[model samples]
Target: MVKVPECRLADELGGLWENSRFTDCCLCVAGQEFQAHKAILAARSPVFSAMFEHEMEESKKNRVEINDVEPEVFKEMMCFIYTGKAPNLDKMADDLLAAADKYALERLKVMCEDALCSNLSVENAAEILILADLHSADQLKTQAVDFINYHASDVLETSGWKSMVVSHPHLVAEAERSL
Candidate 1:
């Protein structure tokens, strides 16, 4: 598996950010406001919102709601929307990636995979595949797993998919597999 960078709860997550309402929300979070375009890109997109909902559900059921999506990490996500650039994947730790994926931020999820794909030499294919699988990103996981299984020569690798199995190891196995 590839060793990726650490991920923080808060990071840049806006595109052309300059909406006053968005600014107010950021300020409410006790964070520095971002450009309006960035906010629009992030908010209008539903990427983070959707993902956050899922993560929030899991956290609520398991009693692990994050008090806040760290402003910096949040910023990173926004930044991608605005400028199409996010923090290094290797920089965002596996846990944070998993958390982001649990939230189902499709763009961010892809961004995470992009980060891994670009950064990891072939040797790190499994790392990306593992997380891709764990996040319920069937298509992305397909790419990564395909790469690993075909090129890395790990056909012995497990195939049965469960989000908990791939990304959220702590999640109940039956939660995904019991289907």
Candidate 2:
């Protein structure tokens, strides 16, 4: 049998994204535009699959306007969609988690969750917990709560904790009950 070349699927797909080859959809975010393939995006994300499969204006016009996500965050997420990897995930984990959740990209969400968990600290525990709850990242949420419990004195003194107490009192109550 002839030796087949090593699988280059990720490379080829990443090249398509970089070169904008055969791109059929345009994603507009924060005044920036990204050219992408609907089929590839749909295959990677159930949210995108539903958007494209339904009678949505985005399908008819071939363009989607994204208002909630920053351009950089969206670009990183698109990179993950095309290549199954995102090099910027470490620095962008917080925003990326939200983007991943929006697109129903479970693996990316989990990756972001893991990254955030690794960087957890007293100053950011409350913020990370809020983000995890918003994105339904149960693993990250549990870890953040556990971290907060271990360092309750310092964590409670943080501004993030005060903000969370005001904006998400229910989460604080739940966290207290768990302690």
Candidate 3:
């Protein structure tokens, strides 16, 4: 068995998130704000580390405006960073997966992939499969492909499948070959 120390380190640091104590940055997403410590954000994500490490506009202003992300999605991401618990991904797995990928949170990305794969359906498989491919989510793609292969007739009947055939014909052929 692997032995590890009992620790309050995560709790103390995470408490900083709750009180905004010594927080040096404010991340804005779609007009909502998230207060965070630069040291903690830098510790968790290389991208954030880079942003805060140098003498850049973000570092200078202590603020950053996030794009292409919803406020709720960004909030949950911060929650994960602070707590080390997986975010509840029921309503936002797709967007969270993208955000997690961008932040290089491979474990979180995988968790989101599992959530998506678990929720896969004929109506959503093609869309999920295409997104999985785009994001290079191997597990999610494989699961989605398996669903598609097993329910080809049903999946192909969806508009998502038709659009995918037109937009990503190569993936359709590839999935066919995998079957």
Candidate 4:
């Protein structure tokens, strides 16, 4: 497998560490962001280190697809790894939450939500609510207040005419006129 350059590793994750973007690759790519590099070095978390090495192996073999997501997120994720803080936002996006769950990156998912909430634009209500509803993410529901105002009823109905019957009672209520 071709070795990824040491320099580019950090470069790739710079945006996450900086909190300017919301990319997910940095979690596995060593030296890319925040305390990830240090974590790799320390091997404190064997599971993560193994995952990191596995990701590198795949990347080295050119088996992983490299696509555009964002740069700042990599920077900020990295920063959080080291400093334990992600920008100032209080929530991330639906996409990141799915990814975090997929990768077992629970902390990152929470951080992403925290980042996304700081500026919960009404524009993100439907999409954000769908994810939060599906995941039973209460905090996400709160952050979703921005977009919830516009399409609360619609989102509730979409979750299901009676999704709130038991699965998401509070969410159902929240989606109603409770705002």
Encode model 2's per-residue lDDT on 1-179: one tens digit a residue: 99988998998999999999899888889888888998999999999889888846743588888998988899899999999999999988999999999899999999999999999999999989998998999999999999999999998899999998999999899899884
Candidate 1 residue lDDT tens string, 105-155: 566666666666665445555555566566665655556555544453443
TM-score of each: 0.46, 0.89, 0.87, 0.42
Error of 3 at 35 (Å): 2.1
Clashes of each: 50, 0, 0, 39
- Alpha-carbon error at 136 in model 3, in Å? 2.1
Model 4, stretches more than 4 Å misplaced?
1-48, 53-68, 88-103, 115-123, 133-138, 141-179
Give one digit per residue, the lDDT tens place, for model 4 in 27-60: 3233333222434322333434565565466444
Candidate 3 colliding pairs, count: 0
Q: Rate the local accuracy (lDDT) of all candidates.
A: 0.48, 0.91, 0.85, 0.49
Candidate 3 — which residues are off by over 4 angstroms? 1-9
lDDT of 3: 0.85
Which runs of model 1 end up more than 4 angstroms from their true locations?
A: 1-22, 27-42, 45-71, 81-84, 87-90, 93-104, 120-123, 152-179
Over 1-179, each residue of candidate 3 has an lDDT whose tens digit, in order, gives 99897998777876888788888788888887778988878888888889888745743489878896887788778877887765477788999999888887777889899899989999989899989988889899999988999999988899999999999999998898994
